[PDB]
Write a protein that holds these residues in place. Structure first.
Motif, PDB file in Angstrom:
ATOM      1  N   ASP G  77       0.835  -1.192   0.000  1.00  7.34           N
ATOM      2  CA  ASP G  77       0.000   0.000   0.000  1.00  7.34           C
ATOM      3  C   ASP G  77       0.874   1.249   0.000  1.00  7.34           C
ATOM      4  N   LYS G  79       0.319   4.117   1.325  1.00  2.17           N
ATOM      5  CA  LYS G  79       0.266   4.872   2.570  1.00  2.17           C
ATOM      6  C   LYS G  79       0.606   4.026   3.788  1.00  2.17           C
TER       7      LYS G  79
ATOM      8  N   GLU I  46      -5.552  15.316  -3.023  1.00  2.00           N
ATOM      9  CA  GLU I  46      -5.216  14.160  -2.199  1.00  2.00           C
ATOM     10  C   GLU I  46      -6.456  13.368  -1.807  1.00  2.00           C
ATOM     11  N   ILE I  47      -7.595  14.048  -1.636  1.00  2.00           N
ATOM     12  CA  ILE I  47      -8.852  13.360  -1.349  1.00  2.00           C
ATOM     13  C   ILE I  47      -9.324  12.571  -2.564  1.00  2.00           C
ATOM     14  N   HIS I  49      -7.259  11.397  -4.892  1.00  5.74           N
ATOM     15  CA  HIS I  49      -6.313  10.289  -5.005  1.00  5.74           C
ATOM     16  C   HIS I  49      -6.616   9.192  -3.990  1.00  5.74           C
ATOM     17  N   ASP I  50      -7.071   9.573  -2.792  1.00  2.00           N
ATOM     18  CA  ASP I  50      -7.483   8.591  -1.794  1.00  2.00           C
ATOM     19  C   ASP I  50      -8.756   7.868  -2.217  1.00  2.00           C
ATOM     20  N   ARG I  51      -9.684   8.586  -2.861  1.00  2.21           N
ATOM     21  CA  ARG I  51     -10.886   7.954  -3.400  1.00  2.21           C
ATOM     22  C   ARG I  51     -10.550   7.010  -4.549  1.00  2.21           C
ATOM     23  N   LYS I  53      -7.624   5.416  -4.844  1.00  2.00           N
ATOM     24  CA  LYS I  53      -6.969   4.268  -4.221  1.00  2.00           C
ATOM     25  C   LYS I  53      -7.979   3.356  -3.533  1.00  2.00           C
ATOM     26  N   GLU I  54      -9.015   3.941  -2.921  1.00  2.00           N
ATOM     27  CA  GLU I  54     -10.079   3.148  -2.312  1.00  2.00           C
ATOM     28  C   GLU I  54     -10.898   2.415  -3.367  1.00  2.00           C
TER      29      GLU I  54
END
Lengths: 133, 31, 43, 122, 791, 28, 119, 67, 130
Positions: G77, G79, I46-47, I49-51, I53-54
């Motif tokens: 991952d 992160k 970044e939000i 990119h996090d979405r 990645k999720e």
RNA sequence: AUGAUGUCAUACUUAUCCUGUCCCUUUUUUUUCCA
């Protein structure tokens, strides 16, 4: 002759490939509007017996067959597809005329079950030719 | 699965008692 | 539409008695059987 | 939405007769193809002759009206009272004409003409 | 009952231990049971999977970005490149499409020919097809297609601030009736931990009370705030309203988790669910320590799971020192709910209302479908504005009422204008349900006739005139004979008052009662009996047993269930392989409560892998758990739906018939066109395939595979009969001693057999057999032989 | 039906409504 | 000229190569893989079907029985570094990497039959 | 379909009957059939193909995609 | 002649499919030039990119356990249209043509009203007399 | 030498009788991815 019919057959094949005609298949066992085409065929068949006269035994037999196919559509559809698969021997046809006092025009006489089969078959092929244009 | 093992809960319920809400049968103006 | 053996023997005896051209006379004997059905079942 | 007043004046106009667009069995009437030549071979299948082979009361609709012709045909005859003077009306001794209303077996012959309604017409 | 919760927690850790043991068995079974050409095939496969994975993720991420200068240019480029990709694949598919579209005559086949696959758009399109068919048959033109020439074309010379929108949103939130009382609201919330907050409609309680807790900061430590509802549709309505109150999209801090719709992106503060997920994380969580303060839905819906939730909330009040739980309520019947929670305080909210004068008839009648028609004609000759809601109690009479009212409407022309009347059902496609929610035309006085949907769940716009006869069907089950009579009963006074609230929800109400005011005040019911005194508890006895309660009839409740229902449930569980001689759940008894279906339908799973056939009976156990009834046979048509249903018929009961329905729906694209042309509701059996997906997912916990016997449907019926041993009959039920009657909608309505099982015991007019199946009582004697004696 | 009379006269051929439509098309 | 007249399996493998070609064209036009021929770094084994109860240096030493690994890098991952069951072992030779992929595939290490293929 | 065509072929191979008139139809058509109207229109269509020719018939009907 | 016409249709369909494949390759070349134009055009982050990645980890989770991937496939947009209309507040368009029910079925009938020849069965007047 | 036994049609009995049926609501957990 032979070569004339062969040339007409070849030209028919050429025009059929020119028109991109997808061919009419065998009727499917679960058709979407087979009930509605049977309703239209029943309208065509019950158009003749709409007088409610004294009739005879064969006419009342044909009306009873019409009402039997009216009650059970599914067995009639299965029997129609069964005859289209299998039945290549049919009953003999009667013939008669009417006089229009200038000429005579024939009227044929077919078995009622074959009449129901050919009526629904005619409705299906006419809608098939409409759909394929 | 046996015969007397299905009645111990009924024996415990009979020892506990019966509530009026536990099967409230609607009946009024009886004669 | 059904054809019992009694009906078949009645049809055969009516053909051997009444010839071949007479069919309404045979259909009078055969109950619930038209002359076209009798002719088709015979021939 | 399409209101009643949009097609109300043109209800029985058009060759396919605009009221036919709101028919009951018009959804299963989307499948009848070649019914004209079905009638033109029904003339080869049926011993009686259809004069209305060229039309359809469901597809093409009803194409005329004769009730105003009936009303003016009554009006051209000198009136209902003039007609009832000709007929046997006053022997019936009704107070008015407006209440009037008209209306498994074996036999040796069945095709006999009915003398009774012609007798009562006479 | 704090030790009950402790024992339930211990059952959670031994359930986790059993899951770990089954996992250990799974890896135990897993452990027990040209080189550059290999590199090239590995790279072709890996680049194919990477190509499809990036292609699947691409417009998914464009949708994720669109749900929220150089980023705009990259989004434009990404839209353009998926556009070029989709026309590239469509160009290849189109080259294949007129590769296919040739003459291609049928081959002469040895024997029968082989049928091939097909089509067009089925639902609704044939009406416009007939419309433009008449238009093409009527319209006409002449000349060639090049006929626009010689046109001079003379022309006419003629004569020579979203911040304000957000401020309006908080002004709307200020306009609520709970906004002047929100300080007293949180004052009583901080005062008491068991507080009941009642209030009339229009207060916005379910959308402002979690908000007023959210500025109160009870959700502060990560212990989030939940919102349960009696219905998933009402839950999504409250979730969407709160989600657009803050602009927080779903998945985020305003998120939801209902059945087959679990949109939480692990950031959710305001979580939205129904009572069954409170059951499921009671079955996975011993106490809501991850939930600080959770609002409670109303008890007037009287859901049995919410009554079990009330018992669990009283056990939480005994277990925790506090949770500061709070119960939102509608009407003034909070005395019993106050005394249930140790003299709970009740705070009232005034609701903004209307003059909703309840009318009366000065005559008693027993018809109520022609006097109301005379009354609505009198409505149409008095004052125009206002939509009309008329209540009835059944499909088979509401369609006849619709037919005769439409006949009365079509009897007149310019007089009696519009008056479109729409009914509401449960086994119903949602398109005309959306047409109900469509607003009325201005020349119309639109009537939505209804069953109890508008009484209980549904609130529709613009309604003023409401006709109410106060009658609904009740599924009253009597265990003296074991018969579940569906019988029409008069409704309640509070039911008529909430129907009057439905009348006056929008404007000044016109609730016309269809009887006398004396019969409303005196002869009518004043309290609706709950579901527990009307039915049995066959789905929840197993769940309450597996959630740590052995004193089920000693468990605390508002009112106890009838003891005969509990006794027949326990004796049925004895006949099942779920209870021992001591009346306690086995490992199988715990594992059949892992899945929320009835135990009578979990002996499907217990007969699965006995001699396999598991996939067929698992599909059957999925699709027989439907709420709405299958098959869509409307007013008129009739014969087309009947012929499709007859085509669906197979011998051996209607379970195999509807199994063929789902089987041929598989590999049919799962389309609406299939269910339209086969006359099936495309709302409930989609939920049945969702249940099939969920029950495929919940199979490793019971450790049952998806084996199938591949068309051995007599053995599938053997497993079905292994499940269905209590519900059997010889023209008479061998257990209930009742003379049977076969339903006309059953597949075996004709040919009454020597031995038939059944599934359901609903009386409507006769002692009806619903969902029958042919048997011979051979393998019936195999299952529960203690239950079975003397043939 | 004077309402239907004026509705037909307002949804008729209406040359002045055509002049308003063409004048707004020219001005736009 | 027409491409017809080949074997049936020949037409099948040419059409499979055409589908792989259109996937390569699709990746090139999207731009995730903008190069022409699109090929991985050779002598780098992608390790899949892994378990979170192993080690990267231990996996490289285990793969060194059929040819040694110069370096290892597990794609975890971005992160948290959780076990994504995906690794890249850069070996010394391509034949050594292929022999390690042929001698370490379906090996139940930490109750998981791990597999090694090209990167 | 070929079985449909065999049904068409065997349908006209039946015996015309009128009292003592009995002979099998084998080269004429029967206008008592329901599909007989369709096959007469199909026969007249291929006569239109024979008389007009395929190029002029294509100029009649236009393209098959846009008739 | 039928076998010869079968062979002729087969070779003509081969020719038409080959020229259709040639035109498909020409369209592929022209739209690959358009793809090179796209490549030349491309020459809360970044939000998001996090979405992403999720969503990628959820896609790999759906690859590990094959099912409908949450509200993106079980719901998607093709969910129950009642909760698409209500649980999602976004409405949809209105197709078809809307009429009144009071005009909708005044005309009816199962067949046309000419029962055969239909000569001596009256029915010459459309409406009633009085 | 006359029995068992199959739904085969015909006969007969009974002052036998002239024939019935489509559900209001409704919620129910947990795991990997390539230059």
């Amino acid at each position: 002759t032979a070569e004339e019919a062969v040339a007409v057959y070849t030209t028919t094949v050429h025009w059929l490939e020119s028109r991109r005609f997808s061919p009419i298949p065998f009727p499917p066992l679960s058709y979407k509007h087979d009930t509605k085409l049977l309703i239209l065929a029943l309208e065509r068949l019950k158009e003749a017996y709409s007088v409610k006269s004294r009739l005879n035994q064969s006419q009342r037999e044909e009306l009873g067959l019409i009402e039997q196919a009216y009650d059970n559509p599914h067995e009639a559809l299965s029997r129609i597809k069964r005859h289209l698969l299998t039945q290549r021997a049919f009953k003999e046809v009667g013939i008669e005329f009417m006089d229009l006092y200038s000429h005579l025009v024939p009227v044929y006489d077919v078995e009622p079950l074959e009449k129901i089969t050919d009526a629904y078959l005619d409705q299906y092929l006419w809608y098939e030719a409409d759909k394929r244009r | 699965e046996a015969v007397p093992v299905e009645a111990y809960g009924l024996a415990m319920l009979r020892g506990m008692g019966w509530k009026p809400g536990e099967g409230i049968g609607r009946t009024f103006n009886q004669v | 539409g059904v054809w019992r053996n009694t009906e078949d023997e009645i049809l055969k005896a009516a053909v051997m008695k009444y010839g071949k051209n007479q069919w309404s006379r045979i259909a009078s004997l055969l109950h619930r059987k038209s002359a076209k059905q009798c002719k088709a079942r015979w021939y | 939405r399409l209101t009643l007043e949009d097609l109300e004046d043109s209800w029985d106009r058009g060759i396919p007769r605009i009221n036919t667009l709101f028919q009951k069995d018009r959804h299963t009437l989307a499948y009848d193809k070649g019914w004209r030549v079905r009638t033109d071979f029904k003339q080869y299948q049926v011993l009686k002759q259809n004069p209305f082979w060229w039309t359809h009361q469901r597809h093409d609709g009803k194409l005329w009206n004769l009730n105003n012709y009936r009303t003016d045909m009554i009006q051209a005859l000198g009136g209902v009272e003039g007609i009832l003077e000709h007929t046997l009306f006053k022997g019936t001794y009704f107070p008015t004409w407006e209440g009037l209303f008209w209306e498994k077996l074996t036999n040796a012959q069945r095709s006999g003409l009915n003398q009774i309604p012609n007798r009562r017409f006479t | 009952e704090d030790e009950w919760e402790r024992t339930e927690r211990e059952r959670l850790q031994d359930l986790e231990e059993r899951d770990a043991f089954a996992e250990r068995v799974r890896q135990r079974d897993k452990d027990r049971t040209m080189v550059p050409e290999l590199r090239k095939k590995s790279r072709r496969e890996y680049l194919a999977k990477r190509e499809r994975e990036k292609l699947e993720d691409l417009e998914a991420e464009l949708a994720d970005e669109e749900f929220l200068r150089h980023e705009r240019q990259e989004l434009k480029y990404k839209r353009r490149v998926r556009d070029l990709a989709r026309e590239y694949r469509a160009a290849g598919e189109q080259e294949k499409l007129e590769a296919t579209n040739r003459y291609h005559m049928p081959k002469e086949t040895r024997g029968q020919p082989a049928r091939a696959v097909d089509e067009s758009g089925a639902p609704g399109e044939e009406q416009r097809r007939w419309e433009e068919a008449r238009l093409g048959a009527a319209s006409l033109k002449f000349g060639a297609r090049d006929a626009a020439s010689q046109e001079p074309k003379y022309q006419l010379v003629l004569e020579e601030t979203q911040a304000q929108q957000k401020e309006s949103i908080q002004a709307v939130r200020r306009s609520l009736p709970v906004f002047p009382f929100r300080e007293e609201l949180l004052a009583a919330i901080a005062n008491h931990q068991v507080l009941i907050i009642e209030g009339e409609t229009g207060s916005g309680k379910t959308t402002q009370i979690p908000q007023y807790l959210f500025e109160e900061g009870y959700t502060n430590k990560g212990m989030k705030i939940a919102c349960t509802q009696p219905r998933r549709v009402a839950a999504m309505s409250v979730a969407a309203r709160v989600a657009r109150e803050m602009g927080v999209k779903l998945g985020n801090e305003v998120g939801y988790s209902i059945r087959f719709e679990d949109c939480t992106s692990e950031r959710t503060v305001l979580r939205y669910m129904t009572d069954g997920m409170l059951l499921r994380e009671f079955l996975s969580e011993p106490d809501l320590a991850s939930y600080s303060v959770v609002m409670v839905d109303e008890a007037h819906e009287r859901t049995l799971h919410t009554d079990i939730l009330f018992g669990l909330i009283k056990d939480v009040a005994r277990f925790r020192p506090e949770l500061k739980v709070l119960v939102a309520s509608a009407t003034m019947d909070t005395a019993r709910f106050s005394t249930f929670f140790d003299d709970a305080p009740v705070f009232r909210i005034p609701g903004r209302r209307f003059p909703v004068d309840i009318f009366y008839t000065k005559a008693p009648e027993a018809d109520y479908l022609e006097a109301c028609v005379v009354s609505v004609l009198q409505i149409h000759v008095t004052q125009p504005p206002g939509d009309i809601l008329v209540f009835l109690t059944g499909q088979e009479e509401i369609e006849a009422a619709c037919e005769m009212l439409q006949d009365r409407c079509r009897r007149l022309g310019s007089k009696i204008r519009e008056l479109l009347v729409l009914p509401i059902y449960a086994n119903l496609p949602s398109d005309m349900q959306a047409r109900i929610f469509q607003p009325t035309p201005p020349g119309a006085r639109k009537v939505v006739v209804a069953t109890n949907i508008a009484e209980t769940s549904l609130t529709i716009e613009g309604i003023i005139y409401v006709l109410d006869p106060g009658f609904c069907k009740q599924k009253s089950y009597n265990p003296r004979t074991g018969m579940e009579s569906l019988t029409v009963t008069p409704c309640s006074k509070a039911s008529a008052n909430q129907r009057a609230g439905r009348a006056g929800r929008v404007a000044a109400g016109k609730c016309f009662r269809l009887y006398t005011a004396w019969a409303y005040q005196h002869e009518l019911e004043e309290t609706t009996v709950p579901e527990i005194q009307r039915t049995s508890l066959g789905n929840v006895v197993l769940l309450l047993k597996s959630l740590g309660i052995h004193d089920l009839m000693h468990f605390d409740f508002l009112d106890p269930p009838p003891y005969e229902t509990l006794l027949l449930a326990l004796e049925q569980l004895y006949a099942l392989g779920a209870l021992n001689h001591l009346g306690e759940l086995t490992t199988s008894g715990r594992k059949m409560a892992e899945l929320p279906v009835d135990p009578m339908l979990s002996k499907m799973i217990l007969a699965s892998e006995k001699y396999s056939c598991s996939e067929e009976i698992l599909t059957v156990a999925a699709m027989l758990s439907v709420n709405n009834s299958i098959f869509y046979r409307p007013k008129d048509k009739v014969v087309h739906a009947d012929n499709a249903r007859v085509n669906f018929f197979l011998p051996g009961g209607d379970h195999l018939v509807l199994l063929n329905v789902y089987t041929q729906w598989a590999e049919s694209g799962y389309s609406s066109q299939w269910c339209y042309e086969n006359f099936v509701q495309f709302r409930s059996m989609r939920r049945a395939r969702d249940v099939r997906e969920q029950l495929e997912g919940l199979l490793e916990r019971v450790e049952v595979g998806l084996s199938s016997c591949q068309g051995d449907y007599i053995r599938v019926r053997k497993a079905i009969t292994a499940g269905y041993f209590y519900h059997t009959a010889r023209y008479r039920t061998v257990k209930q001693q009742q003379t049977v009657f076969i339903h006309p909608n059953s597949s075996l309505f004709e040919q009454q057999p020597r031995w038939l099982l059944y599934h359901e015991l609903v009386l409507t007019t006769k002692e009806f057999m619903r969902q029958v199946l042919e048997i011979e009582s051979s393998w019936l004697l195999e299952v529960a032989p203690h239950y079975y004696k003397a043939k | 039906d004077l309402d239907r009379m004026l509705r037909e006269q307002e949804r008729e051929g209406d040359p002045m409504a055509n002049f308003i439509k063409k004048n707004k098309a020219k001005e736009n | 000229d027409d491409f017809k007249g080949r074997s049936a399996e020949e037409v099948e493998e040419i059409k499979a190569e055409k589908e792989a070609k259109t996937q390569a064209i699709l990746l090139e036009m999207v731009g995730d893989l903008p190069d022409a021929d699109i090929k991985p770094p050779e002598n780098v084994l992608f390790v899949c079907k892994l378990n979170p109860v192993t080690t990267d240096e231990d996996l490289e030493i285990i793969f060194s029985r059929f040819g040694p690994i110069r370096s290892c890098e597990v794609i975890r991952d971005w992160k948290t570094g959780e076990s994504l069951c995906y690794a890249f072992i850069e070996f010394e030779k391509e034949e050594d990497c292929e022999k390690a992929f042929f001698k370490m595939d379906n090996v139940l290490i930490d109750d998981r039959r791990i597999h090694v293929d090209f990167s | 379909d070929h079985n449909i065509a065999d049904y068409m072929t065997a349908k006209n191979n039946v015996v015309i009957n009128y009292k003592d008139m009995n002979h099998t139809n084998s080269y004429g058509i029967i206008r008592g059939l329901q599909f007989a109207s369709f096959i007469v229109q199909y026969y007249g269509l291929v006569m239109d193909l024979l008389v007009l020719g395929l190029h002029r018939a294509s100029e009649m009907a236009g393209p098959p995609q846009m008739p | 002649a039928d076998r010869k016409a079968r062979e002729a249709v087969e070779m003509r369909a081969q020719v038409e499919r080959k020229m259709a494949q040639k035109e498909k390759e020409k369209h592929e070349e022209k739209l690959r030039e358009m793809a090179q134009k796209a490549r030349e055009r491309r020459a809360r982050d970044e939000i998001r990119h996090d979405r992403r990645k999720e969503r990628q980890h959820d896609r790999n989770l759906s690859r590990a356990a094959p099912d409908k991937r949450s509200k993106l496939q079980r719901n998607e947009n093709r969910d129950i249209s009642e909760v698409i209309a209500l649980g999602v507040p976004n409405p949809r368009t209105s197709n078809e043509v809307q009429y009144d029910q009071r005009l909708f079925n005044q005309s009816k009938g199962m067949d046309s009203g000419f029962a055969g020849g239909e000569d001596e069965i009256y029915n010459v007047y459309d409406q009633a007399w009085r």
